[PDB]
Amino acid sequence: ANLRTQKRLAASVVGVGKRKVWLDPNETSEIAQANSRNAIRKLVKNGTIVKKAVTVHSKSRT
Amino acid sequence: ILQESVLNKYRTAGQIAQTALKYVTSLINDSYHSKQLTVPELCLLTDSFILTRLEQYYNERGIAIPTTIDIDQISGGWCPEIDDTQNLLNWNKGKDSTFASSVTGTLRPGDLVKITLGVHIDGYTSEVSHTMVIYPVDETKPILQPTGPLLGGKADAVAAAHIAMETVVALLACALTPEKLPASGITGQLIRTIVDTIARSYNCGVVPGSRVRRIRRFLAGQNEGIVAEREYKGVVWTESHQEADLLSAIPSDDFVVQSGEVYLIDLKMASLEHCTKKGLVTLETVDSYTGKSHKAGELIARPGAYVRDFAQTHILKLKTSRQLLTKIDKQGVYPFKLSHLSSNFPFVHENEEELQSLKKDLKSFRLGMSEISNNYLCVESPIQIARWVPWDHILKATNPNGNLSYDATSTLTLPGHELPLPKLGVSAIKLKSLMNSTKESISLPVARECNTIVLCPELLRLTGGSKTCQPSWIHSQHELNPQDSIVQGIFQLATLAKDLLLKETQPMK
Amino acid sequence: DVVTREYTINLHKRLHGVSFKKRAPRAVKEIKKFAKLHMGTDDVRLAPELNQAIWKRGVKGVEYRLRLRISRKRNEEEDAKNPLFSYVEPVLVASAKGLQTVVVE
Amino acid sequence: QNRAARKNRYVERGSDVVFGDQDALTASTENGVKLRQTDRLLDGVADGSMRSKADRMAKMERRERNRHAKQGESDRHNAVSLSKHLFSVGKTDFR
Amino acid sequence: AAQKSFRIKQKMAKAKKQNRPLPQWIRLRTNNTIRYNAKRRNWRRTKMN
Amino acid sequence: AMKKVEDGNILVFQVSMKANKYQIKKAVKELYEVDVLKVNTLVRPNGTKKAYVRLTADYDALDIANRIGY
């Protein structure tokens, strides 16, 4: 399969880059069925696609 | 298995169909024979009635077959909406007088009306149909039984329908007893033999779509042309059998009917009082395209029934389409209209404002169905007219590749890879070409009779009966050749049924 | 035939004198070699956790000793060569120093 | 866990019993087009036998170009017979 | 570009409508010499000025 | 286009290159007996002209789409 379009659309929907967004590899057919931002939003809320919180840059030392 | 739960569900599904048949046959006599409703107005009223009846008794339950009213040429599929009435006019505005009944909705005299419908509960279904006939009125008579019997080929057709119906009923009744059958135990060989000789006696050929078959839960044969199945025991009479009978899957040999089983009968007879010659009886589809041809005999229409192929999936871009798909898949695997899926359709009370509400909903549903159909999720159940072809054109034909011609842009696949007559190596595409390629474009009139039965010791006939499908008295000829094996057997069968036990379910008041 | 065993492997002497940008893939290949030697099967499946354990200190900082669990198994596939295959997992422990190999239930 | 598991299991609708095993209604078209999409290559040709005839003919004629290793039916780079600059102390024209 | 003139856009539209292969129902014709489109164009191979 | 119907009560037509928004408004109003709110035009890459036509809320695009046939 090929979830390139889905990763792109999920990034554009959630408002982050593709480096963040995460696709669970088990729900592959359910993700590949999606070809629309509404479906990607459904997968965002149900817990199939998540946001991957930020890589930290601490300033304790500074 | 025939449990009490199964068979009483069959009974209460059947007698709803019976009383709805009585309702329609009520209404048509109210409208025409009595001192005026159109076809599509009859249809949704009948379906409203059936669902209003279904609500009282009983999870998967509803209408298997939407009520189809064929008229005088159509083997099956005619069941339009109220959306399409002006469309039918302004499409067929330039054509000729034929198909005026189906085009306008008002029925004429001498018009052979084949009604059919069905109802299902938890997958256990019951189909029925009846060929009735319009004949003008008596005015000087006080009671006004309408004047004149029918005489011609349509009379032939009705006679063959009724006689074939009763004979196959009796045969499947003797299926219980390995006795009480004239040896002149039971097989599709015998069934096809007796029905073919009846058809030959009355000079009315069998239509390709007709069949007699087994039923199981959710698997009746409602579609029979679109969806496939491996386990299908039953008999059909198509062009392959026509050519084989002229010479001398659906296997007929390894097939002997047994106790504790439910069966569907569906017989279609196309009359031949002209035609002059030996020839084939095939089917032609009706499209909405005025522009493919110039000839006036062609009918232009849009089918109303659909069916959705639950194996496929595709996200729609359109909100209305996705909501309509919700409404569809919350219904079952049986065909449906757009009117069935709505808010006000059963018509608890009925007025013009509710019909208007339904029309607006329909205007949205057609937009949804556009995208649902452009993607291959739902398909149309086609409108088929019986059409005659003489063997001369076929034998003089030229088919530069036989057994290899697909039709390639037919959308369903199963009517595409058919090969109706493997001998002579002609396919449906070239057969359509030859049917069109001739000024002998003779379309036949057809009569239809459909019943549902079950074998326990008696034959419990869940449809039919004398209240239902009592025949319009007619005046036919070619009335059943004596002096043969099979005819002796048939008459002995008819006499012996009076004792065999045939139970029949009555309609609901 | 079907057996699981703990082992410890000295990667220092196997990666002695290896390019820094080749040290960790060489450790992967040497672990596959190790499993093939001990079990005698060519197909060897590492775990992504073992890959993480190798690549934790980057290409050029792989630990000198690692503690592995090698589990031989059947191939349930339709039909394949190598009817058995080895599956290597990591053992996360205090320190791999001072241990010897033992069979596991 | 048992509450959730008893809520989990299914009722086996009739959609399943019909169309679980089955597939390939409105089978694979060639160019992966919808019902209304205007396929130019194959609108005129109706039947699959002559469709295969045409495809085989195209594959037969593609070969001498595929031998010359073109990027398609559009690469017509035409190479000269000889270049003047390649044949020619002081200034020279190349290093 | 992106602020074209209509002349350039019209020429581009002609080029787009030309950028096709040859139909298959022309192979099947009596006395057909044509087997491919020799005036075919691609944005990367040849420029159309 | 079909989505734009239910979205904005909008029809989508192919029209002449020689035409303009006034003529398109007049033509839709003459042929289909509807009042038009605005027209928006573009020229496609294949050389034709596309026109989005927004109708007033009095008239509904679904009726006109059913009347035409598509």
Added chain:
Amino acid sequence: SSLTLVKEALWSVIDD
């Protein structure tokens, strides 16, 4: 030549 024979027999049956 099977089509020849079956068409011959079919002509035979339809002519009478």
Added chain:
Amino acid sequence: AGVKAYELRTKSKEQLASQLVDLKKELAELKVQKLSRPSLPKIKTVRKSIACVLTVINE
């Protein structure tokens, strides 16, 4: 098929204009089918009937 110029030459001006309008409506009705089906030959006949009518009018 289609119209006949010798038939139209007897007709009047207003009948001809009405026939032209009807032919234009029919052609438009065919052009919405032409986008769903590729082949639709009646359009040739009506499109040439329009030209015949216009020729007669200019004559």
Added chain:
RNA sequence: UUCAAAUGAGAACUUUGAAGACUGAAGUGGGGAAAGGUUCCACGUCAACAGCAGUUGGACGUGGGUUAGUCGAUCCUAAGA
């Protein structure tokens, strides 16, 4: 650069995930002018091309897509014609 799985006849090169690294705000980022012209996006999809490979592609086949009273041209004049 690596590990597993998925897809597939076939995976060093495709997809997802798990790791390790890089550009390091005078970027391997986000947008534009000239030029190009559909290369954008989707669906199928491997004969030729991508100096290995290929299930992938700016390739091949078929479609979709560019909406302005307010952004620009249009108007003004500059050197000049």
